[PDB]
């Protein structure tokens, strides 16, 4: 996160850390959607062009964390993965179209003050909220500049109009994505950065006071570059795939 701030304790009870065993290091962010399911970006586990292809034995999930490097003794819960599901049409060959994956924890975790699931959006929620001008929130332990924080960072960013998004990159944008960030003429700044991938872009419903996960940190060219925007996976659009795997398994 660039130009963000330290999160308050229990600000994102659904934030998860993707952590590898050997070497022990931070893979990506993610989110708790239920007692047994974690949502992340597919490129966190699979990315051939870089020889990245993690299996369940390769990772561990750390939930209820605040401190990046600290083993938070009676606070965090570490889980082993049972199985990983990548979207079958994830397009790592071109534009990271459908950058999403579901992770199944070996055992359900218990909720606490620090651990709590985020809501998945419904059609009307998505409709009301995913509007240019509307601010969402991204959190992560990623890089501070295009070094690393000691604590989870947060930044609120406005949804940008589709055309503007398209005009900022050479990359082929799809309906499964949306871009967010400030425009060069707004004075405020901020963005996700490396280490933030898989993390959540959330909005607070003014209807029911609930937090909904609208996007997943996907891609962007650099961090907080002027005239550039971060790209996110449109969760609602992939909701049927989600619903699909859960019911299925």
């Amino acid at each position: 996160i660039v130009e963000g701030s330290d999160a308050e304790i229990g600000m994102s009870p659904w934030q998860v850390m993707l952590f590898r065993k050997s070497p022990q290091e931070l893979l990506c962010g993610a989110s708790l959607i239920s007692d047994r399911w974690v949502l992340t970006a597919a490129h966190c586990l699979l990315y051939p062009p870089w020889d990245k292809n993690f299996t369940e034995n390769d990772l561990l999930v750390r939930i209820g964390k605040h401190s990046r490097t600290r083993y938070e003794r009676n606070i965090e819960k570490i889980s082993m993965l049972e199985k990983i599901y990548i979207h079958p049409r994830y397009n790592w060959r071109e534009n990271l179209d459908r950058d999403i994956a579901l992770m199944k924890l070996k055992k359900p975790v218990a909720f606490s003050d620090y651990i709590h699931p985020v809501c998945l959006p419904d059609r009307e929620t998505a409709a009301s909220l995913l509007q240019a001008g509307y601010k969402g929130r991204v959190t992560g332990w990623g890089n501070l500049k295009e070094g690393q924080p000691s604590v989870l960072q947060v930044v609120n960013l406005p949804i940008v109009e589709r055309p503007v998004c398209k005009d900022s990159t050479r990359i082929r944008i799809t309906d499964n994505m949306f871009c967010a960030g400030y425009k060069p003429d707004e004075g405020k700044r901020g963005d996700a950065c490396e280490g933030d991938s898989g993390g959540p872009f959330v909005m607070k419903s003014p209807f029911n006071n609930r937090w909904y996960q609208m996007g997943i940190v996907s891609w962007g060219e650099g961090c907080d570059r002027d005239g550039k925007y971060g790209f996110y996976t449109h969760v609602f659009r992939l909701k049927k795939w989600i619903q699909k795997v859960i019911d299925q398994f």
Partner: peptide, 26 residues
């Protein structure tokens, strides 16, 4: 279910330091 309701905030009727920012954009 009980999703999107944080124990240390919503459940206690406490607002985080910058959520007002989001809501005011809606």
């Amino acid at each position: 279910a009980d999703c999107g309701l944080r124990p240390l905030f919503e459940k206690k009727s406490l607002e985080d330091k910058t959520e007002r920012e989001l809501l005011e954009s809606y």
